[PDB]
Structure 1
Amino acid sequence: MRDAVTTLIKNYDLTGRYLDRNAMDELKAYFESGSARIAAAAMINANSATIVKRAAAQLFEEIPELIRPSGNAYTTRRFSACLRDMDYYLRYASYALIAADNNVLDERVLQGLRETYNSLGVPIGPTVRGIQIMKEMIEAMAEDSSLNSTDFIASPFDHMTRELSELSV
């Protein structure tokens, strides 16, 4: 796992360089965003269960076939597994928000994810849509609350969305 500081250090060590002005500026940006990142993670912790439940409900309202026969959320077994997967995505998105780096998603969520869903027949597209639903809910929550910085919030979710979804163009 690599966070923003580790990513920067790796970049500079690759060339055997001491940290210069640009490195110090990037580290300063991360450190000043740290409070907002911590607040966003705490807000997610305060609402994770309801976020997951509401996002799943919205997804099954948008794609009702999922909870109907032959849908991959059909039956309580598959429904529970789906809510479990949504919980996974939210927890690792919170990790990525704190780290200001999406490598945690790459290492522990995305690598081999397409293979697993293909093996099980889990449909990728609805999962990506559910990720986006949770992202929108988090963004609205952050806007409602007394949080100053909320632009970083989208970064992990979008990353997962780009990494897992099929390439159309």
Structure 2
Amino acid sequence: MKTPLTEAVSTADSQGRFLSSTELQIAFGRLRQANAGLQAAKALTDNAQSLVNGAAQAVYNKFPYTTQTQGNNFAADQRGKDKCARDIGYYLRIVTYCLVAGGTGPLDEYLIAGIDEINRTFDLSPSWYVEALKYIKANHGLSGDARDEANSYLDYAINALS
């Protein structure tokens, strides 16, 4: 779980030493980031339903076949659309967790680790999720430090996918 506080103590603990000014500066950086991260999480949470639905519809528009082709991995039927909305909701919710935590640790532990085996086994293309993340980027309406931090997590998920 990579966050500034956790990483700082882990570096110190592996060295078996008390926290020095280096770890304190890490905490100061976390403190500078934290408020923008928390209100970005709030803004994403309040707009979560429309963002997830819009991201799913964006994937359907760019990849129409996912709504016409019959298959377990496609969203042609109602359950496929539910799986897709739930997956994008997973991505959005875990991004907020990254925003409140201050690092990619929630994405790493909950979503990124093993996602390649998921997509290979269940025949889900990472390109679909890339477009969902791209829609979330373009429509979250965040600004300043909030947008920067949120887009870094969204780009982290995209870079892991592609």
Instruction: Report the TM-score, using the length of structure 1 for normalisation.
Output: 0.85
Q: Distance in 1 between matches of 2:159 and 2:105?
A: 14
In 2, distance between residues paired with 1:132 and 1:149?
16
1:26 matched residue in structure 2: 26
Q: Flag the 1:58–1:113 CA change in 2: closer, same or farther, 3 A.
A: same
Q: What RMSD over aligned residues (CA atoms) do the two structures have, in Å?
A: 1.8
What does residue range 1-150 of structure 1 map to in structure 2 within 5 Å?
Answer: 1-70=1-70, 72-138=74-140, 141-143=141-143, 149-150=146-147
Does 44-53 or 60-69 show the bigger shift? 60-69
Aligned to 1:163: 160
Deviation at residue 61 of structure 1 after TM alignment: 1.4
2:150 alignment partner AA: I
Gapped regions of structure 1 (runs ≥ 5) = none
Percent of aligned pairs with the same amino acid: 24
Cα offset for 1:5?
0.4
CA distance in 2, matches of 1:120, 1:154: 27
| Shift, 1:17, TM fit | 3.2
Give the Cα–Cα distance (whole angstroms) in 1 for the partners of residues 98 and 88 of structure 2.
15
- The offset of 1:9, in angstroms, is 1.0
**What is the number of equivalent residue pairs in this alignment?**
160
Once the two structures are TM-superposed, the CA of residue 45 in structure 1 deviates from its matched residue by: 1.3
d(CA) in 2 for partners of 1:95, 1:37: 10
Runs of 5+ in structure 2 lacking a partner? none
